[PDB]
Amino acid sequence: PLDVALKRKYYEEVRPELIRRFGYQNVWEVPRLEKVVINQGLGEAKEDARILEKAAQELALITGQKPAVTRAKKSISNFKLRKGMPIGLRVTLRRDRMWIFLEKLLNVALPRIRDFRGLNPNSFDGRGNYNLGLREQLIFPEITYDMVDALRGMDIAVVTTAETDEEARALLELLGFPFRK
Amino acid sequence: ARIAGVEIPRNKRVDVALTYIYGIGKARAKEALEKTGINPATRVKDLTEAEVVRLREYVENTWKLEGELRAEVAANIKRLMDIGCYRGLRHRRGLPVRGQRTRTNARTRKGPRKTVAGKKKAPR
């Protein structure tokens, strides 16, 4: 649907809180998610003749978008492969789809991380926006222990209107991000 | 059948399956099966969604358990880096901490034989 929980939560709960905390004059000054770009590194797939198109069609279930097939820009003998035919797997989420993804991630996925004490509170640093990376991709509901074969982690960058990480920290913590105080 | 975090037994008699947890052996296993009142001869294959939750209830709530059990012992070995007790060292030199003969074996605490030697006797 064109409406989801978090989306509602943002408007009818967080929006105001922030206007009250930091005293914004204009609706637009009030920070808002921009996007959540998620990406997998994949140092293999190159070699062992590995098609490994297993990861995108899989990823597509969790993110809800067919991911995009990213490739190496230099040649590195040291670290293998030569520009081009190379490997990496990246998807960009905005609007509803962005929301549905975070909804599930926060409300479900981070729960069944192996350890967990909260998300690292040093991954904005002024440079608004927040990064974190994961190890197991089966922590999401859609992924099952049957489906897996290799445990491919991922990086999650989440980008915002906030120009300082003060006001960005608030936004995420209030949207339901558990931070490791 | 993922009771403890990254841990999932299957298609084996549950009694020993539960062994396949760090922090759970034959003892804490049988102990839990009577208290949940379930036949251990039965497999993880087959059971009610109720049986499953009933089991993970009792277990995960009682004691601990991979992760923060594992993380706990470490902090205890860590604390033996106080001013530095005897058990503190031996942990510092990776040697037997429990009063043994280093002169010969100890290989379990010492990675396989670093033969490294060049001793001499008479040439002329």
Partner: peptide
């Protein structure tokens, strides 16, 4: 498509995903 998550912590959440059939071993209520 619209989905229905089911916790072992009783709780049912209403998001949307691929396949509504969802067995969760506890959400962020625990």
């Amino acid at each position: 498509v619209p989905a229905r998550i089911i916790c072992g912590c009783g709780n049912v959440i209403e998001t949307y995903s691929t396949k509504p059939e969802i067995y969760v071993e506890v959400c962020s209520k625990c």
